[PDB]
Design an enzyme around this catalytic site. Structure first.
Site, PDB file in Angstrom:
ATOM      1  CE  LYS A 122       3.600   3.188   3.720  1.00 51.70           C
ATOM      2  NZ  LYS A 122       4.577   3.246   4.815  1.00 51.70           N
ATOM      3  CE1 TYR A 171       1.240  -0.352   4.249  1.00 56.75           C
ATOM      4  CE2 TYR A 171       0.061   1.734   4.419  1.00 56.75           C
ATOM      5  CZ  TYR A 171       0.955   0.808   4.936  1.00 56.75           C
ATOM      6  OH  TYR A 171       1.532   1.012   6.164  1.00 56.75           O
ATOM      7  CG  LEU A 174       8.791   2.123   4.156  1.00 57.40           C
ATOM      8  CD1 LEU A 174       8.601   1.028   3.130  1.00 57.40           C
ATOM      9  CD2 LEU A 174       7.481   2.775   4.447  1.00 57.40           C
ATOM     10  CD  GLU A 198      10.469   1.408  10.086  1.00 61.28           C
ATOM     11  OE1 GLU A 198      10.355   2.331   9.252  1.00 61.28           O
ATOM     12  OE2 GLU A 198      10.424   0.205   9.760  1.00 61.28           O
TER      13      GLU A 198
HETATM   14  C1  LIG Z   1       4.618   4.159   5.809  1.00 65.30           C
HETATM   15  C2  LIG Z   1       5.700   4.027   6.817  1.00 65.30           C
HETATM   16  C3  LIG Z   1       6.614   5.093   7.191  1.00 65.30           C
HETATM   17  C4  LIG Z   1       6.551   6.521   6.583  1.00 65.30           C
HETATM   18  O1  LIG Z   1       6.854   6.592   5.219  1.00 65.30           O
HETATM   19  P1  LIG Z   1       6.303   7.831   4.460  1.00 65.30           P
HETATM   20  O2  LIG Z   1       6.351   7.534   2.940  1.00 65.30           O
HETATM   21  O3  LIG Z   1       7.202   8.941   4.804  1.00 65.30           O
HETATM   22  O4  LIG Z   1       4.919   8.102   4.885  1.00 65.30           O
HETATM   23  C5  LIG Z   1       7.606   4.912   8.116  1.00 65.30           C
HETATM   24  N1  LIG Z   1       7.737   3.706   8.705  1.00 65.30           N
HETATM   25  C6  LIG Z   1       6.946   2.629   8.451  1.00 65.30           C
HETATM   26  C7  LIG Z   1       7.228   1.335   9.208  1.00 65.30           C
HETATM   27  C8  LIG Z   1       5.910   2.799   7.487  1.00 65.30           C
HETATM   28  O5  LIG Z   1       5.156   1.696   7.268  1.00 65.30           O
END
Ligand SMILES: *Cc1c(COP(=O)(O)O)cnc(C)c1O
Ligand SMILES: *Cc1c(COP(=O)(O)O)cnc(C)c1O
Lengths: 277, 277
Positions: free
Chosen positions: A145, A31, A201, A177
């Site tokens: 993702k 996603y 990610l 993260e």
């Molecule tokens: C979606 C997500 C993010 C943020 O990524 P963006 O593209 O900046 O929104 C950070 N960490 C994880 C674990 C995510 O799934």
């Protein structure tokens, strides 16, 4: 409102997910979330690019070109008359009789996408938020993702129960993260963050913020920092498409430095604000 | 066919999953697979118990008694006139506007169950299969039979591409389990299998095979073995509700002993047979 169902924009009611959609049985999908400001999509291309990258890492083949997808997202924002908020979209391997292995190449991936009116988290951007350290137990392919977010819902839930906004995950001391955001740490004027590998990610906001750092000539070191080090930083903040640059002024009851939003975070926020429509 | 949707049995065409079902957006749920032999549900209670255990592990509250659930599965088998196959049923936290943390304690979990005619793997039980070692990159809560299965989908697909039946996962040399089975080894008349902890899923078929070993007075040692020790074993086999006791005569071109199904595997199968309806 309206939903993107594959290549069609239809009324919400007309959408029906099959019990055997591989996303519903195996979380076999990927996603993206795209922020929309005043009717204009923010970094759509960066996100579409990643959607296709995510899909490629798990061998899913999106039947549409990035342009068509771009067109569909644009039409979705028009139909729903979205002003300020976000768009959510996912792609799954498709509906097929349950089995672990990949289906037949006859099976077309299922694309679902909808919009949501959501104002910017002003108070949070301005005041900062509380966070909590939670052990990272997710799989070793965090660079994708995917819809396998059970480890992330549990972590965010633990955070929520503790009255915190986000959970800062760590694989044995080393900070990685947030359950749904990237983590930054500022010490003596220098920006630190975990290097993009399989353990995190590569956030789009993360990359935009690293860009902003280059524009204001702030040194960026993509080196991992421990949980102890994270507490000794001068400033701390998390980033995500919806959280943007959210300051973390406390972790487990311990104020970061003095508990006020730092100088460089403010500066980075100001530089980021220029890239917004 | 017919499908169990919550506490009702309906035509398949009447079931409609919402896009915001947490099982579709987070793989936030649990499932079970029960083998049906000549209309009779094999070890259905053990499986009902695990569904509840699994759901409790991630704080999902199934709204019915296990008794009511047993009844519904019974009506599903009849309504579909299932003779020999299996039942697939899953529970997700429910439908709620997208967010990582748990919804309000008013969102009812969504239950889905269906059947499929599928004969026993007679040829595999008789001749054995080929497998391939695969690195285990799954999250750390493998004791939960959840919908987060992308890691097992990828591993099984690798096994399939190499022209193998199953993938034997391992975390740095230590053989854990299969992508959808448990692994057992036999060396000098003693049965070995990895302990039941968060690293693996405590299968029902695995427990039944342990009971068969006790009944036939075969010593059982629940201690982990390495990929190297695995190749030196006299016999090898994997277990699952649909695979039963499927022998493994070769791993990556390396034959197990002489590439034939062995003594004790045959004894165990014979004993396991005395439990089948
Ligand atoms: C979606 C997500 C993010 C943020 O990524 P963006 O593209 O900046 O929104 C950070 N960490 C994880 C674990 C995510 O799934
Ligand atoms: C379901 C499953 C098994 C087997 O469990 P059974 O109750 O024997 O069917 C084994 N390993 C994994 C990883 C599983 O998901």
């Amino acid at each position: 409102g309206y939903t993107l169902w594959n290549d069609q924009i239809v009324k919400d009611e007309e959408v029906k997910i099959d019990k055997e959609d591989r996303g519903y049985q195996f979380g076999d999908g990927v996603y993206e979330v795209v922020k929309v400001y005043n009717g204009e999509m923010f970094t759509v291309n960066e996100h579409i690019d990643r959607l296709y990258a995510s899909a490629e890492k798990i061998r899913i083949t999106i039947p549409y070109t990035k342009d068509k997808f771009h067109q569909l997202l644009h039409e979705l924002v028009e139909k729903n008359e979205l002003n300020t908020g976000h768009i959510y979209f996912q792609v799954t391997r498709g509906t097929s009789p349950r089995a672990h292995q990949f289906p037949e190449n006859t099976v077309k991936p299922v694309i679902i996408g909808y919009t949501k009116e959501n104002p910017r988290p002003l108070e949070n951007l301005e005041k900062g938020v509380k966070a909590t350290f939670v052990e990272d137990i997710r799989w070793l392919r965090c660079d994708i993702k995917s819809l396998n977010l059970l480890g992330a819902v549990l972590a965010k839930q633990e955070a929520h129960e503790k009255g915190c906004y986000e959970a800062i995950l760590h694989r044995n001391n080393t900070v990685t993260e947030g359950s749904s955001s990237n983590v930054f740490g500022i010490k003596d004027g220098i920006l630190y963050t975990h290097p993009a590998n399989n353990m995190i990610l590569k956030g789009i906001t993360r990359d935009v913020v690293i860009a902003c750092a280059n524009e204001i000539n702030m040194p960026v070191k993509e080196i991992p920092f421990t949980t102890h080090e994270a507490l000794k930083m001068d400033e701390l903040f998390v980033t995500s498409t919806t959280s943007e640059i959210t300051p973390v002024i406390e972790i487990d009851g311990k104020l970061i430095r003095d508990g006020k939003v730092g100088e460089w975070t403010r500066k980075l926020q100001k530089q980021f604000e220029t890239k917004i429509p």
